[PDB]
Amino acid sequence: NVAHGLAWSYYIGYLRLILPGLRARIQAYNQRHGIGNHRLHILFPLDCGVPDDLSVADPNIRFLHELPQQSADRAGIKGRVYTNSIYELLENGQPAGVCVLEYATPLQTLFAMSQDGRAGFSREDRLEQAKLFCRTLEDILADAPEAQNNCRLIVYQEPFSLSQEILRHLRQEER
Amino acid sequence: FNVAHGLAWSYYIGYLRLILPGLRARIQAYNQRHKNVGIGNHRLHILFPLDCGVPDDLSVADPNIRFLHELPQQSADRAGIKGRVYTNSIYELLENGQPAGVCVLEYATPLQTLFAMSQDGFSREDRLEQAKLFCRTLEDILADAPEAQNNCRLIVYQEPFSLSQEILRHLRQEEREV
Numbered sequence: 221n222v223a224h225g226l227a228w229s230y231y232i233g234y235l236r237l238i239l240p241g242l243r244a245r246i247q248a249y250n251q252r253h254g255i256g257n258h259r260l261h262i263l264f265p266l267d268c269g270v271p272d273d274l275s276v277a278d279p280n281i282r283f284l285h286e287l288p289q290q291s292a293d294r295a296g297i298k299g300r301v302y303t304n305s306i307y308e309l310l311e312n313g314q315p316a317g318v319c320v321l322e323y324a325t326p327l328q329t330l331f332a333m334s335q336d337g338r339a340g341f342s343r344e345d346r347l348e349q350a351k352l353f354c355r356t357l358e359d360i361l362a363d364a365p366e367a368q369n370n371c372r373l374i375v376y377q378e379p380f381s382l383s384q385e386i387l388r389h390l391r392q393e394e395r
Numbered sequence: 396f397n398v399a400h401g402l403a404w405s406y407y408i409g410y411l412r413l414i415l416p417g418l419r420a421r422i423q424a425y426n427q428r429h430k431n432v433g434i435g436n437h438r439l440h441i442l443f444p445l446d447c448g449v450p451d452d453l454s455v456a457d458p459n460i461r462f463l464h465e466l467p468q469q470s471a472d473r474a475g476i477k478g479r480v481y482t483n484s485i486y487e488l489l490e491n492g493q494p495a496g497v498c499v500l501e502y503a504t505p506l507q508t509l510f511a512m513s514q515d516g517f518s519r520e521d522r523l524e525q526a527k528l529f530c531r532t533l534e535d536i537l538a539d540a541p542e543a544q545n546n547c548r549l550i551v552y553q554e555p556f557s558l559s560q561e562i563l564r565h566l567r568q569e570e571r572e573v
């Protein structure tokens with residue numbers, strides 16, 4: 221039952237660490253190089269298919285630029301680096317949305333566990349933990365309104381246009 | 396409400412399995428660019444305080460752990476994040492003020508997650524209970540992983556003692572092992 225650990229790890233060791241300073245980094249980027257939405261948009265594919273490059277697997281998702289990095293001495297690691305990536309969403313091939321976008325890496329852990337031969341993780345076990353991971357994280361954010369307001373949770377299950385799914389969320393947020 | 400199994404598989408799949416294959420190449424890159432004693436221990440040494448006291452700067456834990464230099468930083472695309480950076484730090488361990496050992500050294504960062512969970516029904520004895528379960532679950536994973544069990548060393552201790560002397564014992568054991 222790894223979902224409970226993955227969710228608290230994801231929240232303690234990343235979300236509540238990176239979300240406070242995200243708006244200022246987004247503002248800094250708009251000063252030099254716009255990005256209307258100032259939330260981290262996290263993708264939650266329950267199939268746990270997490271490619272390393274987002275834009276390489278979709279013509280309507282295009283990498284734009286890195287945000288200004290955020291460095292910190294972390295647990296004996298001097299200058300641990302946290303980078304987030306700006307992507308533009310394309311509709312008929314002409315910018316439709318721009319936002320800081322990434323996957324929820326804990327799902328990548330669930331997938332690799334399902335592929336590990338030295339483990340008893342089945343694709344049914346993974347989908348069970350994938351839902352339980354999302355629910356646990358959502359329960360944490362429900363009592364953390366600042367972090368909850370500083371990110372967007374995009375939960376879906378591919379049987380589809382990911383760029384359309386993302387743009388649907390961006391248009392809902394504009395209200 | 397058990398988190399140790401999640402922390403263990405997260406630490407292995409999301410870090411060790413990714414960072415350990417190329418650690419030796421990074422270390423030999425360092426040895427060719429700097430003079431030492433050089434780094435003859437190619438294992439990542441991971442401090443595992445069961446009390447979950449994880450300061451960010453190792454010199455707070457013991458001034459006889461002195462930061463030397465960073466390893467070559469690595470860049471990779473992962474989980475939709477472009478150029479996620481992987482960086483590790485080299486420390487020298489002092490004996491009578493003089494360098495007696497050099498290695499790549501850090502804390503097991505997920506132990507901070509266990510600590511923050513104890514601040515805010517998660518007591519410190521549940522925290523200590525989860526840390527031990529974190530340790531032994533990870534050791535079972537390393538037990539079935541020949542490559543990673545050879546490229547890293549967990550240093551497991553409970554603080555009631557010289558942490559620098561604890562590390563030097565592992566390094567001396569590793570160097571004198573048949």
Ligand SMILES: Nc1ncnc2c1ncn2[C@@H]1O[C@@H]2COP(=O)(O)O[C@H]3[C@@H](O)[C@H](n4cnc5c(N)ncnc54)O[C@@H]3COP(=O)(O)O[C@H]2[C@H]1O
Nearest residue numbers: 229230233234301302325326405406409410480481504505
């Ligand atoms: N810079 C970053 N970019 C994107 N996402 C980030 C991030 N830092 C943290 N996260 C997210 O939050 C989790 C953090 O867990 P934590 O850092 O306590 O515990 C981490 C950490 O102790 C170790 N680890 C992974 N990558 C590392 C790195 N570049 N440097 C040092 N330690 C790392 O492995 C554990 C599991 O990492 P995993 O990626 O599975 O899980 C990560 C990841 O999903």
